[PDB]
Amino acid sequence: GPLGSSTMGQVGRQLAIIGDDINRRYDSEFQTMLQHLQPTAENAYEYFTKIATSLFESGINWGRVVALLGFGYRLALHVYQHGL
């Protein structure tokens, strides 16, 4: 097919490499952070928003936003798996 030889296909595979590297570098770190926070459904929103406010206090860039999104995803998984 034409996708994989196009520049768009190539960039998609480069983003796979980068996204897998983000996952390897930080997934377990996020889990450790969340095990220390012990979020539940009762405090997940308040924890996430206060963390976000501190995060962006010193600035915003796309790396910080995607760190927050990945941490938030892991936070939602933590709340789900412990509220079962």
Ligand X SMILES: CCCCCCCCOCCOCCOCCOCCO
The residues binding ligand X (CB under 6 A) are: 20, 23-24, 27, 57-62, 65, 69-70, 72-73, 76-77, 80
Nearest distance from C-beta of residue 4 to a copy of itself, angstroms = 7
Q: Which residue has the tokens 């097919």?
A: 1
- Vertex 68, ends 63 and 70: CA angle to 5°? 95
* 59 Cβ contact partners less than 8 Å away, ≥ 6 residues apart: none
User: Which DSSP category does 4 fall into?
Assistant: T
Q: Which one of 11, 16, 18, 65 is in contact with ligand LBN (CB under 6 A)?
A: 65
The span of 1-9, 36-44, 46-54, 55-63 binding ligand LBN (CB under 6 A) equals 55-63
